[PDB]
């Protein structure tokens, strides 16, 4: 059932058929921007969805703004019909040339003058727009950018409830949270003062505001008569009279100002009913209407609060206080009455890239409109034209500021395709417009029963940002309003229907949802009369097979994309699965990727949708294929050429390669993978290699999570990785002169400069070591008299002063490798450089890293490790046939951590590698009844898959392990239990007891030891504090905090603590004296006073506080 034409064939232990294929894994990112700009594809998709009014993003934002006009009414402008132009340059050119992938947009502005009645309309330029590439990313200044969606609380009404500690009486609090405007808090207190808190004011009784709105007292009596507390409050208020109530409102909001009826009415209208000052997003108004069940029969057009809404809110509050289960209002249907939950996904909306960009462009457009109206109110009205009126600077400035500094525009991590795909699929919950770490409570970081199918509950950052960052489930989709929907197939009368429907949180709550694993007959009849069911909120209980209303699509509906490719996930613990999912996003693409032996079916789809594999757009026949490029002749007579980037630096230092996997004269079907990017073997994700694992403690080298590796891996380049560094220097003009890159460098030997070329740059392919010169440049010098002996040496040798200094870029500490490529941008060639620069050159250094001690390895089951030792191939334990094991894992860490899934993966991997042949002459055994007919026989080194939550049960593995094929020598190594009798590599005698063996999938994490090693004897120092400091080129000192000081004090150690804080940290002169003393034969001198105390005194004195240290005699002391 491989959807893609040329998928590799890997049988699966699938016992259920998924009625719906996984949607476009990047659909969430692309659809939002497609809606934003507005394209025919989005329009037809919306029309198919049945939306009455298909309205885009740009047109909506600049349509709600129009028609802008002056107060006098003699001027008014409008602009609409936004259309784009073609892109400037291809994505490759923009990324290579440092440009920004964009395309200009035009808007037709119709300028009209009311008095004369004339029209002036023409197209208006509105800057460039950062268009989005097909992979759902923004190319800004040549650097890949991905904007992660954000979770925010949708505007609406929330009826919170709190219980009195003393009165022990329920207190119902109502809160209205508009998108932009005043905040209302109709809260009932023990004193029964049902009031309104407009902008955090005093709790003036609600009746006063209600009558201020023109609501007659008898109307309050009749409408609220069913309410007793509210009736008493109506009878308790003292201030009466519409004018008096309005003046009281005005004084409470703006005291000390002229109190007038007209001013109060105007202020009320401006604060509540005015669209500009107070607005509710379409989603907010829709949610309010649904909650209160008013104005449901017509599309929402007015997006402002109305008196009917306020009175309905007060009625809802009083009814809920009474304990009424439901309420009805004229013109509205019956609706339930209950307190709302903030964490529910029926209340937390998702604002994708479209929403964020729309908000930013709206802010920019409003800022532009302010200036436009100000200019038009003053400029001459006769010869005015919209061209001279519209100002484009603020909008482009706002767009650029958002794309540059906004916390929701992050670098797209590019360790491997999975990491990028997950980043594009992220669900941020922090950043601008949202919660902050400190302010947010710990109750929001927990899981909610509404997360099933929308937000993966396993995948999450391990650091402090736990629970505030998730990921869309596999099947989750974002509805136009922003609420995450999930698929379901509805059961009509106990028979499952093929057709599916998408239900949001509220609809799911109001219905009954079945469980996918529930057995179903081939005719759709529930065999079990009672089936496990999910109810309103975290309630699961058996229900008759008829009351059930909805059913899931697949058991893997509640897992993210990353977590969907952990075999035997159902056996691991939640924390271990979280760790494994997070670590799957840190794998480093090796040189020769190999597809896993055991892995779920998500590998291929994730690889295809990650965008790192080139896929033929149309079916054709390949004419000629080369490493650099491939040309395919389409069936219609048109030829197309795909250019494959090779050895291109990723966003995080790794290399990206694309090797074709097709042969000349092959007919490729449309959608078939043509070449594999990093971490891909024949069009399926491959983050690591298959290693033969033996689970046992071995002489303590694998003690406490350490790992032992055979030297065969190092000498066979099994885990060899390629990393590409990047250095750059620029020649910026100075007031004292212009810097120029030249081969000649002042006072350096020719041997050191033997690698530089005439232009002054290292020649391609020249090995460069630590501290070597990479590009030679000379900077202008002013005037500085030479030191006596330096000047003399200049005179003796004929070496002139050569005032120009040396600032040549040099390879930082701890770098090496070839120089694969050099890129130079010169202002002379008409290239775009930052102001004040003329010559910018960047040199790429490529290093090939082999696995060694300290490098991190980890499987898919969240079991990290470090290479404790790399034994020679002759020392590793070897099977009975002489096959040394490639890695050893400790057995004391498996059961304690409770990730037993790794052992099952090992057993299945061995079965797949050795191949099995289930006996069938007498018939299929009992344990093989449910196995697919094609899975009873396998070839050696076959490919097998176990989909998450639906895969090989234990009985299947037990049966398979007893039917593995023999080796070429005619003997079976592993026994039925899965263990084998190993031979010791050193002693040479067999181990007393059998040991587990099998092929386990092992990745290589990016926490390599090369980057972590850090040392500093003496380097540069800071300026204000004079403490040790320096970029990681020269390395910085460690941080001797306070706990590290208590540990020292507890020892009774006093001289070490005096040193670590004075002589090697802060003393300006003590540091020099000790360095001289060590570089000389004399002893280390006595430390002085830290500069951090002299600074403290010199600052405390500046506060006009006389701080003076004194002796016993009381005499002031000098410091």
């Amino acid at each position: 059932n491989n959807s893609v034409p040329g998928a590799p064939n890997r049988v699966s232990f699938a016992k259920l058929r998924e009625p719906l294929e996984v949607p476009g894994l990047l659909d969430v990112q692309t659809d939002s921007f497609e809606w934003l700009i507005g394209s025919p594809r989005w329009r037809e998709s919306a029309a198919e969805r049945g939306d009455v009014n298909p309205v885009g993003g740009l047109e909506e934002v600049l349509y709600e703004l129009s028609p802008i006009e002056d107060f006098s009414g003699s001027m008014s402008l409008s602009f609409s019909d936004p259309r784009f132009d073609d892109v400037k340059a291809p994505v490759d050119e923009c990324k290579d040339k440092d440009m920004t992938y964009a395309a200009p947009l035009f808007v037709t502005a119709e300028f009209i003058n009311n008095n004369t009645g004339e029209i002036k309309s023409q197209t208006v330029f509105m800057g460039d727009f950062p268009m989005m590439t097909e992979k759902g990313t923004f190319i800004i200044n040549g650097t890949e950018r991905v904007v992660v969606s954000q979770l925010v609380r949708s505007p609406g009404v929330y009826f919170d409830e709190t219980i009195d500690k003393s009165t022990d009486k329920t207190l119902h609090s109502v809160k209205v949270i508009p998108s932009r405007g005043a905040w209302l808090e109709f809260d009932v207190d023990k004193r029964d003062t049902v009031g309104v808190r407009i902008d955090r004011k005093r709790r003036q009784p609600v009746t006063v505001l209600l009558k201020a709105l023109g609501w007659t007292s008898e109307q309050i009596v009749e409408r609220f008569g069913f309410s007793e507390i509210m009736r008493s409050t109506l009878e308790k208020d003292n201030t009466v009279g519409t004018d008096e109530a309005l003046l009281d409102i005005y004084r409470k909001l703006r005291p000390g100002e002229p109190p007038t009826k007209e001013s109060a009415q105007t202020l009320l209208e401006n604060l509540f009913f005015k669209e500009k000052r107070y607005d509710l997003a379409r989603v907010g108004r829709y949610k309010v209407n649904k909650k209160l069940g008013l104005h449901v029969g017509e599309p929402i057009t007015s997006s402002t609060l109305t008196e009917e809404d306020v009175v309905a809110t007060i009625e809802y509050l009083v009814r809920l206080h009474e304990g009424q289960t439901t309420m009805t209002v004229p013109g509205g249907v019956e609706v339930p009455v209950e307190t709302d939950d903030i964490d529910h996904f029926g209340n937390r909306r998702l604002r994708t890239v479209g929403e964020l960009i729309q908000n930013q462009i709206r802010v920019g457009m409003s800022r532009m409109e302010r200036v436009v109206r100000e200019r038009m109110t003053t400029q001459d009205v006769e010869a005015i034209t919209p061209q001279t009126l519209i100002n484009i600077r603020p909008v482009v400035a706002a767009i650029k500021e958002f794309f540059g500094t906004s916390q929701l525009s992050q670098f797209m991590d590019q360790n491997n395709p999975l990491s990028g795909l997950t980043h594009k699929r992220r669900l941020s919950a922090l950043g601008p417009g949202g919660l902050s770490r400190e302010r947010a409570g710990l109750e929001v970081r927990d899981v909610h029963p509404s997360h099933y199918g929308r937000m993966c509950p396993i995948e999450t950052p391990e650091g402090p940002n736990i629970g505030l960052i998730g990921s869309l489930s596999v099947y989750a989709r974002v509805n136009p309003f922003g609420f995450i929907e999930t698929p379901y197939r509805k059961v009509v009368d106990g028979v499952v229907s093929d057709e599916i429907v998408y239900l949001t949180a509220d609809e799911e709550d109001r219905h009954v949802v079945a469980q996918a694993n529930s057995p179903i007959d081939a005719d759709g009849r529930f065999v079990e009369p009672r089936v496990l069911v999910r109810r309103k909120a975290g309630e699961v209980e058996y229900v008759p097979s008829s009351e059930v209303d909805y059913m899931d699509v697949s058991p893997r509906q509640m897992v993210s994309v990353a977590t969907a490719m952990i075999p035997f996930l159902e056996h691991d613990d939640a924390n271990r699965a979280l760790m494994g999912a997070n670590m799957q996003r840190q794998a480093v693409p090796l040189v020769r990727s190999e597809a896993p032996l055991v892995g779920t079916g998500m590998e291929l789809r994730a690889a295809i949708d990650a965008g790192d594999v080139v896929v033929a757009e149309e079916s054709g026949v390949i004419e000629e294929v080369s490493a650099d490029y491939i040309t395919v002749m389409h069936d219609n007579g048109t030829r197309r050429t795909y250019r494959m980037r090779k050895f291109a630096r990723s966003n995080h230092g790794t290399c990206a390669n694309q090797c074709p996997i097709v042969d000349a004269g092959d007919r490729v079907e449309a959608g078939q993978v043509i070449a594999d990017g990093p971490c891909t073997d024949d069009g399926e994700m491959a983050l690591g290699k298959n290693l033969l694992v033996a689970i046992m403690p071995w002489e303590g080298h694998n003690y406490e999570d350490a790992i032992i590796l055979s030297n065969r891996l190092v000498e066979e380049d099994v885990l060899t990785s390629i990393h590409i560094e990047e250095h750059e220097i620029d020649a910026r003009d100075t007031k004292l002169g212009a810097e120029e890159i030249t081969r000649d460098i002042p006072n350096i030997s020719d041997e050191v400069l033997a690698d530089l070329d005439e232009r002054g740059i290292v020649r391609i392919g020249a090995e460069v070591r630590d501290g070597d010169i990479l590009v030679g440049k000379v900077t202008p010098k002013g005037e500085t008299e030479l030191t006596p002996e330096e000047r003399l040496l200049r005179a003796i040798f004929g070496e002139k002063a050569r005032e120009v200094r040396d600032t040549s870029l040099k390879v930082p500490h701890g770098e090496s490798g070839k120089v694969i490529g050099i890129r130079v941008f010169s202002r002379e060639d008409e290239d775009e450089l930052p102001a004040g620069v003329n010559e910018l050159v960047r040199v790429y250094v490529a290093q090939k890293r082999k696995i060694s001690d300290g490098d991190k390895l980890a499987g898919r089951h969240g079991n990290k490790g470090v290479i404790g030792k790399i034994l020679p191939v002759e020392d590793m334990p070897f099977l009975a046939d002489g096959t040394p094991v490639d890695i050893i894992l400790n057995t004391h860490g498996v059961p304690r951590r409770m990730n037993i899934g790794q052992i099952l993966e090992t057993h299945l991997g061995w079965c797949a590698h050795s191949g099995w042949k289930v006996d069938a002459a007498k018939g299929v055994p009992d344990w093989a009844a449910r196995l697919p007919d094609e899975l009873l026989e396998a070839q050696p080194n076959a490919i097998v898959s176990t989909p998450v939550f639906d895969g090989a049960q234990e009985a299947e593995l037990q049966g398979l392990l007893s039917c593995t094929l023999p080796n070429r020598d005619g003997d079976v190594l592993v026994d039925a239990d899965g263990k084998a009798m190993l031979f010791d590599g050193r002693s040479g005698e067999p181990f007393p007891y059998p040991v587990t063996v099998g092929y386990m999938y092992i990745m290589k994490l990016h926490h390599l030891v090369d980057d972590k090693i850090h040392a500093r004897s003496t380097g540069p120092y800071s300026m204000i504090t004079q403490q040790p400091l320096g970029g990681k080129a020269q390395f910085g000192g460690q941080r001797f905090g306070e706990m590290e000081c208590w540990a020292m004090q507890a020892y009774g150690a006093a001289y070490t603590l005096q040193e670590l804080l004075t002589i090697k940290s802060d003393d300006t002169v003590g540091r020099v004296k000790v360095y001289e003393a060590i570089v000389k034969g004399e002893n280390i001198p006595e430390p002085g006073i830290p500069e951090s105390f002299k600074v403290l005194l010199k600052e405390l004195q500046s506060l006009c506080l006389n701080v003076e240290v004194l002796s016993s005699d009381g005499a002031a002391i000098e410091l």
Binding site: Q407, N747, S749, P788, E789, E790, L792, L793, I796, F797, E799, A835, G836, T1018, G1019, P1020, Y1021, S1022, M1023, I1024, T1025, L1029, G1030, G1031, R1071, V1072, Y1075, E1076, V1079
Partner: protein, 114 residues
């Protein structure tokens, strides 16, 4: 370039407020090793090598070149001090150059010329 708002060293960098920009600014003075160790070591090696020069030649260097009293006394000035002419001193200077460039002296002084 002269019309630009300066950046306040106290604005946070990295956006987590783990440090303000003023923290990460190096100095431009003698480093703990750069000048200190080499300056003192070449001063001691001066006391060792420049002392090897003859007493009259030592004073010649001290005055014309400026070891002790600085103020490099031009051949005319040092000639006024000693009574010698501008031409005679040049031969002795070149002889001193020839003496220094050969042997342990040049070996010691190579490191301070690079």
């Amino acid at each position: 370039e002269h019309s630009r708002d300066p950046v306040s060293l106290d604005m946070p960098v990295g956006s987590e407020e783990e440090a303000p920009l003023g923290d990460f600014i190096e100095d431009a003075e003698a480093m703990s090793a750069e000048n200190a160790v080499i300056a003192e070591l070449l001063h001691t090696d001066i006391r060792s090598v420049l002392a090897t020069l003859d007493e009259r030649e030592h004073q010649v260097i001290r005055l014309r070149f400026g070891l002790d009293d600085g103020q490099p006394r031009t051949l005319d000035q040092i000639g006024k001090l000693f009574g010698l002419s501008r031409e005679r001193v040049r031969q002795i200077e070149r002889d001193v150059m020839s003496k220094l460039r050969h042997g342990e002296r040049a070996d010691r002084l190579r490191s301070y010329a690079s």
